[PDB]
Design a protein around this ligand. Structure first.
Ligand SMILES: NCc1cccc(NC(=O)c2cc(Cl)cc(NC(=O)OCc3ccccc3)c2)c1
Lengths: 156, 39
């Protein structure tokens, strides 16, 4: 099916109507999304099939047709944009300055934007349009708001 | 069965809506890929 670079919606027809379970990025012939969106299952694109290639539940990431291609990183200082693709709504760029997730294994960028759970997998971009990670795995803080990690994979 | 549908190009947009704050939080990541607040 379609292998043009860009952002895509991940849909399912098992529930009522067509429901958006998440979002992904197609780059260099490889489709990149979050593991919790597809659970590693195969994807359809037109009449074509996208089979899983690499995945990891702890990183909450999965790639299709080939290895993880996204290697850009947040520089730690600059503002970024979330290219939010919410269910049933148009793709929209939202500019924000990331916070920080302080872990025992290092610090990770974090974006404090609130969107429906079906927006998981929407890419976070740098000022050059490069994908520095995906939105959709994070935490719920005191005020019920959501803070997602800037989740990036490794390019071998 | 799941399927994909194109939603747009991946580009930075000048004059986009600026929102969101920058919190610094102590977090932990379990074997299941779930984040939690360290308190
Ligand atoms: N560890 C992987 C994983 C598994 C399952 C799910 C997830 N991800 C999420 O739950 C998720 C992802 C996104 Cl993009 C946004 C939110 N938002 C959120 O919880 O907002 C608060 C809220 C809730 C309900 C009504 C109104 C407000 C959650 C990760």
């Amino acid at each position: 099916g379609e292998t043009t670079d860009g952002v895509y919606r991940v849909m399912t027809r098992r529930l009522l109507g067509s429901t958006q379970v998440g979002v992904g990025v197609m780059q260099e012939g490889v489709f990149h999304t979050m593991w919790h969106v597809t659970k590693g299952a195969a994807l359809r694109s037109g009449e074509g099939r996208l089979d899983p290639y690499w995945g990891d539940v702890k990183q909450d990431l999965v790639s299709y047709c080939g290895p993880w291609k996204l290697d850009a990183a947040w520089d730690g200082l600059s503002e970024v944009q979330l290219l939010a693709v919410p269910p049933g709504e148009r793709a929209k760029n939202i500019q924000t300055l990331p916070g920080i997730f302080k872990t025992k294994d290092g610090d990770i960028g974090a974006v404090a934007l609130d969107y429906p759970a079906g927006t998981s997998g929407s890419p976070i971009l740098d000022k050059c349009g490069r994908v520095i990670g995906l939105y959709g795995n994070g935490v719920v803080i005191k005020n019920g708001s959501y803070v997602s990690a800037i989740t990036q994979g490794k390019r071998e | 069965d799941m399927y994909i549908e194109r939603a747009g190009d991946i580009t930075w947009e000048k004059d986009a809506e600026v929102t969101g704050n920058s919190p610094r939080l102590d977090v932990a990541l379990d074997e299941s890929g779930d984040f939690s607040l360290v308190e």
